[PDB]
Amino acid sequence: AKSVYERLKNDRAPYETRAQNCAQYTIPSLFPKYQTPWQAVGARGLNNLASKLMLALFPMQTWMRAKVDEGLSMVERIIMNYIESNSYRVTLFEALKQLVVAGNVLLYLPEPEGSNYNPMKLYRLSSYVVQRDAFGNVLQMVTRDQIAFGALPEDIRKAVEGQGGEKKADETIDVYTHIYLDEDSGEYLRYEEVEGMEVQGSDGTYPKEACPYIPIRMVRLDGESYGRSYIEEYLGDLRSLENLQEAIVKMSMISSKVIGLVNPAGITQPRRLTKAQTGDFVTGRPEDISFLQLEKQADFTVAKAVSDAIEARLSFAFMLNSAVQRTGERVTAEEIRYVASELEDTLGGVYSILSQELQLPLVRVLLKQLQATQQIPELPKEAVEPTISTGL
Amino acid sequence: DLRSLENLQEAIVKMSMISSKVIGLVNPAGITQPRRLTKAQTGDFVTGRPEDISFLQLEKQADFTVAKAVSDAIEARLSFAFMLNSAVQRTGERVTAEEIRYVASELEDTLGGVYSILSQELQLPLVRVLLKQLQATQQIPELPKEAVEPTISTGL
Amino acid sequence: AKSVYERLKNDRAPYETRAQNCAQYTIPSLFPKYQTPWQAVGARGLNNLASKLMLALFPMQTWMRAKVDEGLSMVERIIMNYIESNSYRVTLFEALKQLVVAGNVLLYLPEPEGSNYNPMKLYRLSSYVVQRDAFGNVLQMVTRDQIAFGALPEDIRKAVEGQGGEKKADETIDVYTHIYLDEDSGEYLRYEEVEGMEVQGSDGTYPKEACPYIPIRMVRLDGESYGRSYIEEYLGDLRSLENLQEAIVKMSMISSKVIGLVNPAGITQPRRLTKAQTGDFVTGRPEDISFLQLEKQADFTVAKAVSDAIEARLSFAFMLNSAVQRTGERVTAEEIRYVASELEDTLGGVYSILSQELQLPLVRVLLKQLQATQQIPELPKEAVEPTISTGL
Structure with a gap:
């Protein structure tokens, strides 16, 4: 499916240069x-956005939810044990950090294959x-990757490289992965593709709810697949700050x-002026030696005032400069609603959209994928696939 | 008023x-060259008359201040125009209990009858089409016969 | 494995000059x-970062964790006895000090060999x-070291130096150490390599969880092995401060x-001016003697104002200038959560990443390596290899 990527490359390239130029x-x-x-108020505002949103979407506390609901309690308390x-x-810090820059971060969550160390492989918009x-x-x-020499397992690599050629011992070849919705069926089919062909014995299927690859946006805009960010609308105000303060410091x-x-047609030489203990009296007219004195004290002040204006407006733009309850008591008890409502009132519906596009599908794919090799006995039959209640 | 703010602050930043x-x-008919001026550690003494080298010093400090004052006026009036700059109870307690009436009355007193019109053009027809459409394949048994299609009370 | 280092030297050299140029x-x-x-606000900010993070990750209090859990209590209270x-x-102060400069500090934790003084040998990115x-x-x-003459034990050094040659009595020869994951097996194999060859009787193996060599990063960035630091994004703002205040003081x-x-064509001589008790009247015109009076009082003020701006922003950049509870009471009770949340809200996910890349693998390698020559009897069979719960 190299040709599908090379065809709708044009469908992403307006979103690409916006993301890269705003990064x-x-x-x-x-x-x-x-x-x-050159000067970096945006770099601190971005990390403060991530640091607030990490406590906002899901803290260490219980976020995911008469005689029967104890079995509801275990299956939704085991997932928080698996999540840490x-x-x-x-990696979700990296994900949300990509989310408030580019617009579309993917979250691969592959199969458990035991109880080993299984990392959430992240993808960025250039892939x-x-x-x-x-x-x-x-x-x-359609995801892309570059692969090194020995990083891929050698289970398959004999047949795809048996076509001919003596290559370098760190040859970076691109590999692709496609998931698509079937024509008649409603299941998704997934496969990998190496070297411009199908792979030996890897094609699989997935149920309706839980895609293995979760796409995301931060501001919803219909008509196209991807989405924008609000740093795309503070871009010009930040660009003026960088192109101002570079001139300020220089x-x-x-x-x-x-x-x-020093005058050249005078009597004084600078060679005697260079050697000077304090107190000695060296010859010379006091007219010749002067200094540059470029004389812009007030002209600097307009640049510093416009910088103060941009610096103060970007401060409220990126949730920064807010006296909060970071002076906590050993845990975060009621904190997530305060920070959540403040970032709702400052950023848009990001706390609303990330409760139905991040908190929902992670929980769905982790209540599907974790129960494949099932590690907790579900007791009742009434709510085996129950509701998914996020945010609150 | 917003258009004047954009077409003012573009000129302000530029x-x-x-x-x-x-x-x-630097003067061209002088003695000083700029090529020696470019290389300069602090403290050394390089030749040249102190008349030739000067800087631009475009000298509008007060003339900027009228633009910044008119921008401050637009910035302060647009602040009350769009409900912004209002010390509120966003410092809530785990839920929003009585909050919706305070925010609703303030946006009524600042924006017009938007809280009035959106209670009879948004809160009403969404509830009507969702009490018609959801009950097509009916997922909850309606017990009484007296108020099967009852009133729709919105807002309050 | 000298050739492996000399091959992927290019894979580290972009990370090298960034670390050295930002150090x-x-x-x-x-x-x-x-x-x-020349002027050193960064040197104090760095040490304050280390001094906060040392109380943040693990204080003197219990950090690592009905009738059975007493055996859980002893095995996790003995490790804090071994840790002091x-x-x-x-050495972990040095480690974290390297962590907020370069990006990748290694922590060697060799075998106990008794109950002697066993130091955590640190490595830096130039090795x-x-x-x-x-x-x-x-x-x-692939770690490197230089070794002196007698510092290495003489158990092996006869055969590797019997190749021929009369060398200097402090000849610094480089030695290497390789650990690698096996092709088929999932264990790691470790060995040393001296003089471009294998060593006599030193090759060993290690289990899945606990590598003997723990690598670390501070900001996660996929696609490559190592990582960055946030002083890599305050580098330019600090560089402008140094290149400003050097000019300020000079x-x-x-x-x-x-x-x-003094004028040369006047009447006054400076030789009489040099000798002067207060009160005497020495001859001379009051026109000839003047002083330099370079006359930049306002022109200094723009440099001092821009320095004040950089000095104030770097203050919040490096967690400095924060009124805290360092006025403690004999111990630190609830302090670690306050300092931890503040450095989370100022630095990024460093308190998050160092709870799963420093607090985790140190505890894993110290619950594997310490129990080789087992010094505490594990009573139950149910949780012999239990979970590792870090941070909280």
């Missing part, structure tokens, strides 16, 4: 095309494409220095 | 960026 | 390529390389001095 002025290297941001011991909060319908559901997802460094101008 | 830079003008 | 403006000599930093009497907090996969696990680690020292200029 540059707020974090160095979450998107390539060192080299530091596999280190989910390590995958999604097609959506008029109503707003997924149709097909003006300050020129103003600080002292290039003393 | 004035600030020109004022921040330093295009030092 | 220079914040601490003198945690990385070579005396010579003091071998002086771990001495070792790690390869990672697409999911994010380790594959191979302007102040020139402005303080007094090189009095």
Whole structure:
């Protein structure tokens, strides 16, 4: 399915350069095309956004939910035990950090295969494409990866590399992965594709609810698959801050220095002026030696005032500069509603959309995938596939 | 009023960026060269008359202040125009109990009858089409016969 | 395995010069390529970061965790007894200090061999390389060391130096150490390599969980093995502070001095001016003697204002300038959650990532390695290899 990616590459390339061009002025290297941001109020605002939203969506407390509901309690308390011991909060911080930059981070959550260390493989927008319908559901997802020499298992790599050729011992070849909705059936089919062909013995199917690959957006906009971010609407105000304060500091460094101008047709030499203990009296007219004195004290103040205006408005733009209850008591008890309502009132419906596009499908794929090799006995028959209540 | 704010602050920032830079003008008929001026550790003494090198100094500090004052006026009036800048009870307690009437009355007193019109053009027909459409394949048994199609009371 | 290091040297050299170039403006000599930093707000911010994070990750209190759980209590209270009497907090301060400069500090924790003094040998990024996969696990680690003459034990050194040659009595030869994941097996194999060959009788194996060599990062970034730091995104703002305040002080020292200029074609001599008790009247016109008076009082103020701006923003950047509860009462009781939440809200997910990449593998390798020569009887059979619950 290399041709599908190369065809609808044009369907993602407007979203690509927006994401990359809006990444540059707020974090160095979450998107390539060192080299530091010149001044970085956006870099702190972004991390504060992530640090608030991590406590907002799901804290350490119970977030996911007469004689029968004890079996409801165990199946929804075992998932929080599985969610920490596999280190989910390590990579979901990266996910949400990508979410408030680009717009569409994927979250691969592969099969357990025991009780080992299974990491949430993340993907960024320079690797995958999604097609959506008029109503707003997924149709097909085409992820790409580069693979090194020995990082792939050698189970398959004999036949796909037996076509001919002596290659370098770190040859980076691209591999693809496609999931698509069937024509007649409502199940999704998944497979990998290497070297421009199907793989030996890897094709699989998945039920209706729980896709193995969860796409996400942060602001919903119909008509197309992906979505925007609100740093895409503070982009120009941040761009003006960077292109202002670079000029501010590079003006300050020129103003600080002292290039003393001495007259050439005078009597004084600078060679005697260079050697000077304090107190001695060296010859020379007091007219010749002067200094640069470029004389912009008030002209700096307009730049510092406009910078203060941008600095103060970006402060309320990115949830920063807020006296809060970070002075907690050993746990976070009622904190998530305060921070959640404040980020709702400052950012848009991000606490609303991430409760039905992040809190929902992670719980669905982790109540499907974890129960494949079933590690907890479900006692009742009435609510074997119960509701999924997120957020509250 | 918003259009004037955009077409003002674009000029404000693009004035600030020109004022921040330093295009030092050196005289051409002088003795000083800029090539020696470019290389300068702090403290060394390089030749040259102190008349030739000057800077732009476009000199509008007070003329910026009228633009910043008119921007402050628009910024302060748009603040009350769009319900922003209001100390509220967003410091809630785990739920919203009595909050909806306070916010509703404040947006009524600031925006017009939007809380009135959206209680009879949004809260009403969504409830009507969701008490018709959901009961087509009926998922809850209606017990009484007296109020099978009852009233629709919205807002309050 | 000298050739493996010399091959993927290119895989680390972008991370090398970033770490070394970002070390220079914040601490003198945690990385070579005396010579003091010119002005050093970063040097204090870095040590305050370490001093907060040391109480954050693990204090003196119990951090690691009906009739059966007493045996859980002893095995997790003996490890805190072993963690102080071998002086771990001495070298882990160096480790975390390397962590918020470079990005990848290794923590060797060799075998006990009794109950002697066994030090956590630290490694820095100029000595070792790690390869990672697409999911994010380790594959191979190649550490380097230089060794002096008699510092190595002489158990082996006869055969490796019997190749021929009369060498200097402090000849620094490099030695290497490789650990790698097997092709078929899931155990790691470890060995040393001296002089470009295998060593006599030293090759060993290790179980699945507890690697003897624990790599670490501070901000997670997929696609490559190592990682960045947030001083890599305050680098330019700190660099401007150093290159500003060097000019500030070297302007102040020139402005303080007094090189009095006397006219040469006048009547006054400076030789009579040099000798002067207060009160006497010495001859001379009051036109000839003047002073330099370079006259930049307002031009200094723009440099001091821009320095104040950088100084105030770096203050909140490095957790400094925070009124806290360092006025404690004999112990730290509830303190670790306050400091932990504040550094979470200021630095990123460092308290999250170091609870699953520092607090986890140290506990795993110290519940594997300490129980080799087993010093505490495990009573129950149900939780002999129990869970590892970190952070909380």
